[model samples]
Target: QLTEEQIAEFKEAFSLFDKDGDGTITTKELGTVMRSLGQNPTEAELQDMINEVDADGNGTIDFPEFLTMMARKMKDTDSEEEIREAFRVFDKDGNGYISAAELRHVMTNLGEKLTDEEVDEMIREADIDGDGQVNYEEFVQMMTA
Candidate 1:
């Protein structure tokens, strides 16, 4: 969640895209903003971005949805709870650790297709205890470091 001040900041940014002052941002406006930032996002990319937080699914982004996306992107993951929650997302079996298969599956789902060797290397780098899996502590350390 964003602090009141952060919310205000994001509101101002949101206003830049809400040129019509309709309290919502359309895909065209988002594409305009992306172009302004030198990013020519494809239609699919724009749709994906909108779908990430478009809770109402009304084909537009309201203030709440805009704030949610901003907060997620700007989140400070230094909190232990935050790290633990992120770890839990990939620990599909709730096994308190992320195995190579789980990591590969989650990564692939996120659109990043890593080779088996790359996945093994990631596990090797994060597996501090050499047990061939990443536990919560090691996951946090790898992320924070």
Candidate 2:
């Protein structure tokens, strides 16, 4: 649901967290990045975030892992209404759906470059039915997964 600019910004933010440039982030890396971002996360915060997302336990975080964490914080909890509202802001057209174009824009904003094929793969994963577009439900589910 993020616009092109927003996606790009998100990618940039992600890269900031992925300090090692290894395409994967570890707890230490995330901790450092959070501190730099002015977020003083405690050991508990690290553990909570890790348990919520890190599926591989390789001490590194991938895109999928990060996405899952965000989705849960923004959707699965009744207390995170603010997070949900933030996501709603990204769902710009209010069409109850988000398209590849919007994703591409957001990626650009995040300072990450995504190829058409890569974007398609993301879309395909979310669509699940080869619909070529993702509705809100599909988008949320994909992010959560």
Candidate 3:
């Protein structure tokens, strides 16, 4: 069993990494933790920056793998839970992404307003699929990158 402290720590970590993108990997920390418990085919430490279990080595921690990695290690001790929880915060209306409008909305809340092009600029910066929004994997990648 885990503690609220652990859960809250997870939440806080995700919160910081959720909004805006630059450097990241709340999941990387989570993945590394998972490795210590088992020492398996995970980040020779990703599971070194995010290459452990992902094997694909693309640094994309999908919601599913993130979930799977978390569940196996969850029966123990860590950070992924908070990543998504915080991700939801960025998701705003809860559609599952920090959209261009949503990103600008939050940016305004924090201060400064970004024009459509500027907003798209930031979105596209982290918008891996060109879908015009940052998804879980995109978010994680941005965070870790």
Candidate 3, residues 1-145: lDDT per residue as tens digits?
4334455444454445444453334454554444443333334533353555556655555444444454555566335555566567677577667765566677656645666677656666767676656675456556553
Overall lDDT per candidate, in order of appearance: 0.68, 0.61, 0.54
State which candidate, 1 or 3, has the greater TM-score.
1
Off by over 4 Å in 1: 1-80, 111-118, 128-131
Q: How would you order the candidates by TM-score, starting with the best?
A: 1, 2, 3
TM-score pick, better of 1 and 2? 1
* Model 2: per-residue Cα lDDT over 1-145, one tens digit each: 2234434544566787775688777666777755654334679878888765665676777765665554544454443434345446667878666665676666556545776677667776766666555575546655653
So what's the TM-score on candidate 2?
0.40
Give candidates' CA RMSD values in order: 11.6, 12.8, 16.1
Off by over 4 Å in 2: 1-6, 35-40, 76-145
Give all TM-scores, in the order shown. 0.41, 0.40, 0.32
Per-residue lDDT, model 1, residue 5, is 70
Task: Output the worst ten-in-a-row residue range by lDDT, candidate 1.
Answer: 32-41
